[PDB]
Amino acid sequence: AALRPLVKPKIVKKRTKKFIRHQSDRYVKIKRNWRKPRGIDNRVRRRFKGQILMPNIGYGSNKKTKHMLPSGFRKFLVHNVKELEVLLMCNKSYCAEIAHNVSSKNRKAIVERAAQLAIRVTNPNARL
């Protein structure tokens, strides 16, 4: 059916849940975006048990499967047909996806061009 990648390794994620900021639940003024707690008495910064986890370099993903989409592919944002042509010779590890601003009639031509170039599009039906 769809275009298969060159290789499909098992993608292993050391953590799937998001790193939420300390005390982001107690407030609406505090967004989920991570902030390192620089407080003298902070128990999250001190890394007490049962507290909110702090992100660090140990959670980094494997080189091999980093940035891979859940189907064997890596993303690349295209805005016109010319940017599609650059993915002709990868074609098996990178998939195009159309930017949000591209108009309905223009992205139809992008979808048709990728189909005959054997390029996988992550959003091939997005203005219909």
Partner 1 sequence: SAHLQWMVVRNCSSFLIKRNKQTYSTEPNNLKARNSFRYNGLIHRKTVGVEPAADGKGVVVVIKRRSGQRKPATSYVRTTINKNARATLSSIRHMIRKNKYRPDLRMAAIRRASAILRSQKPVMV
Partner 2 sequence: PHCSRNPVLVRGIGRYSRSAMYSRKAMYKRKYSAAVLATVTKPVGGDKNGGTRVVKLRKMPRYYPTEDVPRKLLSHGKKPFSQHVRKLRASITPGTILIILTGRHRGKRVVFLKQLASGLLLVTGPLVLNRVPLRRTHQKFVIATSTKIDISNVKIPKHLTDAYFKKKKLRKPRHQEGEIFDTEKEKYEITEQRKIDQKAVDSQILPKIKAIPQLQGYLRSVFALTNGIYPHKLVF
Partner RNA sequence: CCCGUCGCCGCGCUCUCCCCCCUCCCGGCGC
Partner RNA sequence: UGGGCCACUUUUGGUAAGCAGAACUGGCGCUGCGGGAUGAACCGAACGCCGGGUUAAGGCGCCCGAUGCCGACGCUCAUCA
Partner RNA sequence: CCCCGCGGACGCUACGCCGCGACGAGUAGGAGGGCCGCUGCGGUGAGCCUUGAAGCCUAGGGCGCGGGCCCGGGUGGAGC
What's the rounded Cα separation, in Å, for the pair 2 and 120?
Answer: 8
Where along the sequence are the contacts to Mg ion (CB under 5 A)?
24, 30
Is beta strand 94-98 parallel, antiparallel or unpaired with respect to 74-78? Answer: parallel
* Least separation in angstroms between CB 65 and partner 2: 16
- Amino acid at site 115: A
Out of 33, 62, 93, 123, name the contact with partner 2 by CB under 8 A. 93
Query: Per CB under 8 A, does 86 bind partner 2?
Result: no
* Least separation in angstroms between CB 121 and partner 2: 17
Query: Per CB under 8 A, does 89 bind partner 2?
Result: yes
Query: Per CB under 8 A, does 25 bind partner 1?
Result: no
- Interface residues for partner 1 in 56-75 (CB under 8 A)? 67, 74-75
What's the rounded Cα separation, in Å, for the pair 22 and 113?
Answer: 47
Nearest residue to 72 via CA among 119, 6, 120: 6
Q: Which residues contact 57 (CB under 8 A, 6 or more apart)?
A: none
Query: Per CB under 7 A, does 117 bind RNA?
Result: no
Out of 43, 74, 79, 92, name the contact with partner 2 by CB under 8 A. 92
What binding mask, one character per residue, do residues 14-53 give for RNA by CB under 7 A, x or -?
Answer: xx--xx------------xxx---x-x----xxxxx----
Q: By the 8 A CB rule, do 98 and 126 touch?
A: yes
What's the rounded Cα separation, in Å, for the pair 47 and 5?
Answer: 41
